[PDB]
Amino acid sequence: CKGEVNFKRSKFVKVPSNVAPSMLFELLLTEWHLPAPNLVVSLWLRDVLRKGLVKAAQSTGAWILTSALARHVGQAVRDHSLAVRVVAIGMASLDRILHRQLLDGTPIHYPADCPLDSNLSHFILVLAELQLSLEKHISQQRTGSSIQIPVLCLLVNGDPSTLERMSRAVEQAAPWLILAGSGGIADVLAALVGQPHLLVPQVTEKQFREKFPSECFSWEAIVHWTELLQNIAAHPHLLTVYDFEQEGDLDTVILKALVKACKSHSRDAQDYLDELKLAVAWDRVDIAKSEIFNGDVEWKSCDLEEVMTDALVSNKPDFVRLFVDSGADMAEFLTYGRLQQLYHSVSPKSLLFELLERKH
């Protein structure tokens, strides 16, 4: 069901039980008319995040999966939108929303002193399972020149139950990147990950009593969280702890984690190719060179060809230096058609474009 809230109208798509995974995706794509996401991330530290990435997202755009500490960041992103574009989707249930009967049965006034955040301009009215489903759906959807789409899990100061949300997500083939200083289950995660015996039957209780000792817990939930943690810690790939109290660049470790991730899933050219396209977007070319080409992958020219075109078109010289140095023979690459393409891919704003146009 389609609805509009003249609050400047926000879109509502009815999110029925067991909804098709590719249904809400195409609905938000078409009914909301947003551009293709080149990146998706599902939610000192208060400035590091909201400055280094928020600014570095403007270059290429991305999608941010959130739920209306959190209010400060919501207001921050609201302030960031005031100054290619990034979109936010309000995938949320209907039970926790107030005045749900008013919107169920045309500006639906839902003034409540609960209501949803009016900063968002879209929503999907119907929870963790939907998150996992959409994540696996986007991670499979190939945005291309056949190009897949990135999705990441940013964890911060979470609660205990999130481990379950992480547990299945570890099976979801999703890299996890967590910060060590957020102040919740993130810190215990950061502490308990490194062990000779990766398990922790009771010292898990030792730390959960050590960190956040406001509520007392039964031993059954403690041993259950212990087995959950033992199951989660068995995928080092998706798992990636880091610190921002000493030194970093969030988009740098971001690529670091994503790259090490696409390392394990498989070893192909096209496998690494999305990530290489990523570094292309981020110009973190040194990282990839040390990491991707020189790291493991022995490339084939015919493959990298496409990317090479991309890189050149970006006036992006260095990566070309490398890809050529990676053994790309532009002599092989060159085609009068290839140059025809390249030139037709010139900037319309360029006086070159105008001059060529007058010529034509």
The CA distance from 321 to 343, in Å, is 20
Token code pair at residue 276: 């290489």
> Which region, left, alpha or beta, applies to residue 323 given φ > 0 means left and ψ of -120 to 50 means alpha?
alpha
- Experimental approach was cryo-EM
Residue that is written with structure tokens 């493959």 in the block:
303
326-356 burial string, b = 16+ CB within 10 Å, else e? bebeeeebeeeeeeeeeeeeeeeeeeeeeee
Helix axes 301-313, 317-325, angle to 10 degrees: 160
Report which of 148, 192, 155, 185 is spatially closest to residue 170, judged by C-alpha positions. 155
Per DSSP, what are the bridge partners of residue 148? 142
Q: Cβ(91)–Cβ(134) under 8 Å?
A: yes
Cα 174 from chain centroid?
A: 10
Q: How many CB atoms lie within 10 A of CB 47?
A: 10
Residue that is written with structure tokens 């570095």 in the block:
56
The CA distance from 61 to 154, in Å, is 17
Residue type, 349: K
In the chain, what's the furthest Cα-to-Cα distance?
Answer: 80
Resolution in A: 4.3
223-237 burial string, b = 16+ CB within 10 Å, else e? eebbebbeebbebeb
The CA distance from 117 to 96, in Å, is 13
Cα 273 from chain centroid?
A: 17
The CA distance from 320 to 332, in Å, is 15
Cα 199 from chain centroid?
A: 29
CA atoms within 13 A on the CB side of 38: 17
User: In degrees rounded to 5, what are phi and psi of residue 58?
Assistant: -60, -30
Helices of type H across the chain: 21-30, 45-48, 54-58, 70-82, 100-104, 128-140, 162-171, 185-192, 203-210, 219-232, 250-265, 269-282, 285-288, 301-313, 317-325, 330-333, 336-344, 351-359
Report which of 339, 278, 289, 330 is spatially closest to residue 308, judged by C-alpha positions. 330
Q: How many CB atoms lie within 10 A of CB 309?
A: 16
Q: How many CB atoms lie within 10 A of CB 123?
A: 22
> What angle (nearest 5°) sits at the alpha carbon of residue 55, between those of residues 288 and 83?
150
- In sequence order, what are the residues at sequence separation of 6 or more whose Cβ sits closer than 8 angstroms to the Cβ of residue 106? 3, 4, 6
Helices of type H across 118-161: 128-140
Q: Cβ(167)–Cβ(228) under 8 Å?
A: yes
> What angle (nearest 5°) sits at the alpha carbon of residue 1, between those of residues 138 and 10?
75
Percent helix, percent strand, percent coil in the chain, to nearest 5 = 50, 10, 40
Residue type, 90: G
The CA distance from 77 to 54, in Å, is 8
Q: Cβ(230)–Cβ(122) under 8 Å?
A: no
- In sequence order, what are the residues at sequence separation of 6 or more whose Cβ sits closer than 8 angstroms to the Cβ of residue 57? 39, 86
The CA distance from 15 to 57, in Å, is 29
Token code pair at residue 325: 């140095």
